[PDB]
Scaffold this active site. Structure first.
Site: not given
Lengths: 363, 362, 364, 359
Positions: D84-85, D164, D183, D221-222, D316, D335-336
């Site tokens: 997760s970025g 994912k 998602n 997530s996708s 976040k 995440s989020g």
């Protein structure tokens, strides 16, 4: 003997920092010999800021692809190839890599007009953290530039049209070390400023003599018309990539330069293209646009917020770095019609260097 | 009776800097009662919640009302105030003050056609109308009305149509729910419906071709939305053979994100005779440029991938690029560069641009 | 005479929404003539060129002037207006309306000490003064003046000192050049904080010199909250303290946020202001907390509980710092209308410690 | 046979810093062949074009493959890699290394239930399936499979389901001609498979508009083009040999810490309101998903969180500040930032893994 240089440039697109598809095809098709690659000069998608990891990702991906095509471990390419990725590709700038090759041939082909492109590379002695942004960095870069001129077989600085310098920046760990040894320390723009001056010294643009730590981040009268400098990492080794012409070049390309007079000026770009060999008055025809192989423009923020008598926001803007490149790109691509252009910059300072490489064909 | 329109471009150092704007009236250079539009660029984000943009609007209205000697309220049907937020790069924030008086005599020796301004207002646009056929029809009627106000019958003589419409608010979408109605989804639905309205009214698109499902061209529409004012507003810039104005307008279409030919066509059709580049004398003939730089329809430019649609700062960058192109031609940083919306006005990847240039007696 | 200070916190839906602000006066709930400060959070970037911040300032001044029946120019010296831009995440934009009247008799049964407000102004701060020892001395004198205005002699009873100072412009530089002088925002802020420290006896004046100003973190004020901008050569000081002779139904306290994830500073502020709690506040106790004024300057390092964080490298660092500070404060008090400022780089509290102050109910 | 799952949290100074990750295997502390998931936070934007996130993925895969002595292509079904970025504020970038072995003996004295990991893969999800009922069904089947892999039959024992999936690209659209939709469809799939939402209630029309349909424990997530959906499932089981237990909670609004505390408490830490230092150290990892709220009203007041251009980053930042203020551990999986079917209206899932020690 290794007597006449033959430099080439191949511009290939990247859809992402790790898209080396079209880069690998260049070698796999036999179009280009990977062993003759001397530089990779690239634009990547991302922020362009100090912590732009997408920029590092392109660097790593390009080194890996090249090493695989050469059949060496990546750790070999380390001194033999300059890899220069500028992050941040806003607006009309298409991410890409310019693959620069050079071989030396025993005989000079017939009918090549005037002067031609030649590439030189050099490395500094180790730059210590107490050297960064100070007179020692200047001297050490100047020596590496002299060495790159010698590698290119060029003696006349007026024939040098672009000097890329990559230097070290400060980290808390480098500071820790100077501090150990009893030393003070100055960081990116200090390093960049010291480097540009080093170029100026080596090209005879600034007498040495005029250099001191207190002029370095300050006296704007001291400048190189053709330096394009950047810093980061910890490699105490400075690197110089130098693009010039020579009367004895076997290359089918020629380089030229200009100075962007302010943020809306296209005359610097045009001068670069013109002095590289395209004969045009104001605008380029489609045929002439295609003679232009690559443009390397550095779009540092301007020295003031006054443009043609009016206030602009470019220094206050939180996105200034990104906008500077957006503007520089729009100007270059509006002239050349070629989105895969090397538009770097966005550092804080009003004149900017731009270089152009154009076709130079036999008679 | 003959219209005489003028434009005075003055700088703003901040959204509430009305110093040079007030001097225009205080010096007797300009009569504040003749002002029909204020078209401005402000510093800020240019996004839906750009309060700096609202600040400029409020400051400009207040200054104008003070110069007219009225309360600020008394100004709300009579003057179009259009502030576009976001002034990246080479764009100098400013206000173009647009005046128009009607005179009894047509001066001698004015060549060809001349600038004329028209204004119009829509019937109230309900929240269930936004982005749908009703908005189209209601905007179209206001554009027809603005043409009539300008004394213009030929749509080919209309070179720029600014529409300001309402956007959905939670309270609007509460109201339509109250009455058993759905809303469309929002600024861009409104903008798209408005542009189409312009197209219908200028005969660019036949009305039978309109339906809620087509709603996502006019070559000259420049549309925006926001607030809750159910009243749509139209400002229309045209030419007429009977204009007393010392200016003329023209337009062009920006073919892609790097194209300067739309801008040049705008300048050229407005009256400047030039091949490729403008001399300094010719650059100074160009009084204002109104360019809308909506994001392109694709991420392919001259055969190559660009980042303009993926960039988080896409709206800001679009204007940065548009500004760089305009100012590189005209040399004038105080240019009206709007846009940055996602891609229904202009052909596909095509953007409108208009230019107002001097038209001098023989 | 006995001061009686009050605070009323009202929401703003936009920088120019003064509806609920104007209702305060129109309902007779608050006398506009007794307003001494407006402390506000506005929506926007929070950066040096945040015009939305200026818009809130202008809107608030105009509304207050109209309620008072004066021209807006009169409120210039009589009311401190402090708008901090940038309201990320859980921070609800709002204005804290601070009033103070002086009464002839001290009500019965007010426990301990109570809130008092003081104000001061500096002698003009020239551009060659900014970030230098002159700014320090001039701010210190204005802080001494504000203490005197509040009737406070003990610096230990001072819990918050807001300073607004001038920043440099090219036009100011031009002036100093004109008179044969050199020049040098964060300089101004740093010089101001030190001024506060000098005046509160936190830093001895001999320790001060231009070379220490932005370099010696050992010199700090636990309670300074400083900002700069514009060209107004007049520095302004707003000072919140307690006094044994206060008639106010409020008390202030303070704490120090130890690092970026620490809630103990916020809790100490609330506790010393008068709320008796071990670790968490009940709903009744949360409602005793009228306002919190927290300054969330970026930390001095990128190491947090032994790990690397991104907070110094992040391009949005200023915005994130406030987002984090707001989340911490609001998670404790449950009140989104909290004064969360900051995001400057790291003289204001210890190495990387941040001040926070809390105003809570003090009932008979 | 008894599963023994573990988690080792290691720092990353940059997306390609696998130094401490590689040391885990090189020191013999961890067997690289037992690694079943890598769950990581990277520095960067966290947006759809965050290449720094991809860089961490590639770097981590390459390091793991090197430690296993295989080519990087062989990790592609055997290990879930989830980066997760976006690591704002107090979030320290890191990788949680999840291992699982099956052992022949169940150790003595392990109290209550213990952590178990399950994994699953969807049948290929075509582009005409994305955001629609087919994606739901296919994700649901992969979740049922992951439960079966974990040896778990009771959905109440499932505390976290990471899915994912693929996103649309112009090139996928082109094929069908012959992100939040994805998602949303995935979360619903989880809900179907855990019995949280009856399948008759599902249709393309309800997907992303009926907020009443939700999973309390989905974190979806996708991106990319891999038609293969992936499921990583964390649960407990009475027959776990693991020295860890998982629990979950629901964050009630943007400023709420009770969801986080419930996660920690139901995972096994006995505390009233605040954790002692000893209790903070019992918390090994927290997996919190901080989707933007459903409204701009918080405790009766207007907030800017939906209007803010940096909303994704701010969400976040806030979620991280809440988690780290409780646990004191910056290396947390926050995440989020998507716009608001992961949990109730206004509600966000959070899971906590805590130590479960022999008597």
């Amino acid at each position: 003997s290794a007597r006449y240089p033959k430099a080439s440039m191949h511009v290939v697109p990247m859809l992402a920092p790790n898209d080396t598809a079209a880069f690998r095809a260049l070698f796999a098709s036999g179009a280009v010999d990977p062993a003759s690659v001397v530089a990779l000069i690239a634009k990547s998608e991302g922020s362009g800021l100090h912590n732009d990891h997408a920029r590092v990702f392109a660097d790593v991906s390009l080194r890996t692809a090249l090493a695989e095509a050469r059949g060496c471990p990546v750790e070999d390419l380390a001194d033999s190839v300059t890899v220069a990725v500028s992050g941040g590709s806003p607006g009309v700038i298409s991410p890409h890599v310019t693959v620069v090759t050079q071989e030396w041939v025993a005989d000079l082909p017939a009918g090549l007009p005037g002067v031609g492109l030649v590439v030189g590379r050099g490395h500094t002695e180790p730059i210590l953290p107490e050297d960064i942004g100070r007179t020692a960095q200047v001297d050490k870069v100047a020596d590496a530039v002299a060495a790159a001129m010698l590698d290119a077989g060029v003696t006349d600085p007026d024939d040098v049209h672009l000097v890329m310098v990559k230097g070290p920046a400060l980290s808390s760990r480098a500071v820790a070390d100077a501090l150990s040894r009893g030393k003070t320390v100055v960081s990116m723009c200090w390093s960049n400023d010291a480097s540009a001056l080093g170029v100026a010294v080596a090209l005879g643009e600034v007498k040495r003599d005029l250099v001191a730590d207190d002029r370095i981040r300050s006296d704007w009268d001291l400048f190189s018309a053709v330096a394009a400098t950047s810093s980061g990492g910890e490699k105490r080794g400075g690197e110089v990539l130098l693009l010039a012409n020579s009367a004895q070049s076997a290359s089918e390309l020629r380089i030229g330069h200009g100075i962007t007079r302010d943020m809306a000026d296209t005359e610097g770009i045009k001068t670069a293209i013109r002095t590289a060999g395209v004969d045009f008055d104001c605008c380029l025809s489609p045929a002439q646009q295609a003679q232009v192989v690559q443009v390397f423009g550095k779009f540092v923020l301007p020295g003031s917020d006054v443009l043609r008598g009016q206030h602009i926001t470019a220094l206050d803007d939180h996105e200034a770095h990104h906008v500077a490149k957006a503007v520089g790109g729009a100007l270059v691509v509006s002239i050349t019609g070629q989105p895969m252009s090397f538009i770097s910059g966005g550092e804080r300072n009003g004149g900017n260097p731009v270089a152009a490489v154009v076709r130079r064909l036999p008679a």
